Amino acid sequence: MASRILLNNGAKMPILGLGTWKSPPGQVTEAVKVAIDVGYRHIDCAHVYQNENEVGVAIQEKLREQVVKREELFIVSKLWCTYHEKGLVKGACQKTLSDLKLDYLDLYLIHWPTGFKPGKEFFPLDESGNVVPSDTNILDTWAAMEELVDEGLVKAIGISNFNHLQVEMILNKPGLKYKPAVNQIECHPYLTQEKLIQYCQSKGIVVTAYSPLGSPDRPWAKPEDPSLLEDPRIKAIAAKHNKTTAQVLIRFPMQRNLVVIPKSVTPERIAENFKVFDFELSSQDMTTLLSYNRNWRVCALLSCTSHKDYPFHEEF
Ligand SMILES: NC(=O)c1ccc[n+]([C@@H]2O[C@H](COP(=O)([O-])OP(=O)(O)OC[C@H]3O[C@@H](n4cnc5c(N)ncnc54)[C@H](OP(=O)(O)O)[C@@H]3O)[C@@H](O)[C@H]2O)c1
Ligand SMILES: O=C(O)CN1C(=O)C[C@@H](c2ccccc2)Sc2ccccc21
Ligand SMILES: O=C(O)CN1C(=O)C[C@@H](c2ccccc2)Sc2ccccc21
Numbered sequence: 001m002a003s004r005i006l007l008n009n010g011a012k013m014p015i016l017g018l019g020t021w022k023s024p025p026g027q028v029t030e031a032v033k034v035a036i037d038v039g040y041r042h043i044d045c046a047h048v049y050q051n052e053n054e055v056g057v058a059i060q061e062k063l064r065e066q067v068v069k070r071e072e073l074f075i076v077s078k079l080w081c082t083y084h085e086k087g088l089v090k091g092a093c094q095k096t097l098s099d100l101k102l103d104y105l106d107l108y109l110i111h112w113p114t115g116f117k118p119g120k121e122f123f124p125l126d127e128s129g130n131v132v133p134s135d136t137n138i139l140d141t142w143a144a145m146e147e148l149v150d151e152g153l154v155k156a157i158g159i160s161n162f163n164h165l166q167v168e169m170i171l172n173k174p175g176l177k178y179k180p181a182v183n184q185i186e187c188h189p190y191l192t193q194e195k196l197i198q199y200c201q202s203k204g205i206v207v208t209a210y211s212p213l214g215s216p217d218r219p220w221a222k223p224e225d226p227s228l229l230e231d232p233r234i235k236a237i238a239a240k241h242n243k244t245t246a247q248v249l250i251r252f253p254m255q256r257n258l259v260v261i262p263k264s265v266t267p268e269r270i271a272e273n274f275k276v277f278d279f280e281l282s283s284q285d286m287t288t289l290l291s292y293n294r295n296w297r298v299c300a301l302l303s304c305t306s307h308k309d310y311p312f313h314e315e316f
Pocket of ligand 2 (some may be wrong): 093123124125219220300301302303304
């Protein structure tokens with residue numbers, strides 16, 4: 001299994017990255033350092049995770065230790081929803097760059113297609129429990145992302161949580177300057193995303209699978225929710241290959257030509273999660289894992305279902 005995939009900007013993206021959502025500032029510095037030591041070169045970040053300073057410290061530390069070169073790293077961050085206004089995008093990107101102590105990002109994503117009212121608060125809600133949106137739109141936000149490229153702040157731009165119609169909006173944009181390189185979407189055996197993956201891949205857009213382990217630490221988890229890591233059917237697949245359930249869950253997207261970004265702050269797990277280039281899932285295993293699809297989302301953005309750009313009304 002080649003370790004990197006070719007992007008439409010000529011750059012190569014490692015197919016296995018480290019997630020950092022919910023990684024406490026108290027622990028992510030260690031997490032990243034260990035990740036880099038055991039082979040990870042792609043780190044998935046976001047301003048909204050409010051830990052990019054601590055990620056940056058780890059990277060800086062390992063550059064000065066001479067463990068890795070900036071050029072070998074693929075650092076990804078995302079524009080949060082309260083910064084969709086054209087006038088706010090550069091400042092949002094430069095803040096991320098400053099926190100990460102970098103002078104470029106390899107990839108910068110619009111985190112969600114939905115713009116939220118600008119302000120200090122990351123998720124402003126109204127008295128009905130719905131998000132307070134902003135007067136922004138995807139195309140205008142995209143043009144703002146293009147300038148980041150044209151100014152050298154990021155090497156590639158993409159999108160996250162966009163449905164195929166929203167992607168299409170950008171693709172068909174008059175005066176398009178840069179095609180999206182990546183669409184980062186939730187993907188695992190309970191949400192297999194066949195049609196959206198088909199769509200993106202046919203459009204030369206690389207797909208990154210988030211929550212590949214089913215995000216057991218998601219803050220809104222309910223006891224009765226489906227649990228991938230516990231799923232006895234998947235454990236059985238793992239046992240057969242003498243690997244852990246998580247390793248099977250990370251290898252699965254890899255064999256669908258996806259990028260995958262499992263999150264851990266546990267040093268032992270960070271290392272284990274990377275040990276997935278030494279076995280292959282059988283044709284039967286893949287077919288089987290794909291058959292567990294339930295269209296079940298970790299991240300359904302339920303507070304925004306009335307937003308004009310809410311992505312998950314569409315079938316895909
Ligand atoms: N673009 C978006 O809107 C979006 C949305 C969600 C996620 N993402 C990105 O995708 C990453 C991955 O998704 P995620 O954080 O939702 O969840 P995930 O990676 O599916 O699951 C992380 C959970 O799994 C546990 N874990 C990791 N390795 C394990 C192993 N080998 N055995 C047992 N448990 C293990 C972690 O625990 P410990 O950390 O305590 O070890 C943590 O609780 C995020 O961190 C983020 O970078 C992007
Ligand atoms: O419902 C979801 O899909 C996730 N969800 C959010 O969308 C609601 C969000 C929120 C909570 C409080 C103030 C502002 C915003 S984040 C959240 C937290 C707990 C539970 C759920 C959420
Ligand atoms: O967007 C992600 O990558 C995950 N995620 C967050 O990082 C946003 C998080 C948040 C919500 C409210 C105040 C502060 C932070 S949780 C969340 C909820 C819905 C959707 C997404 C999130």
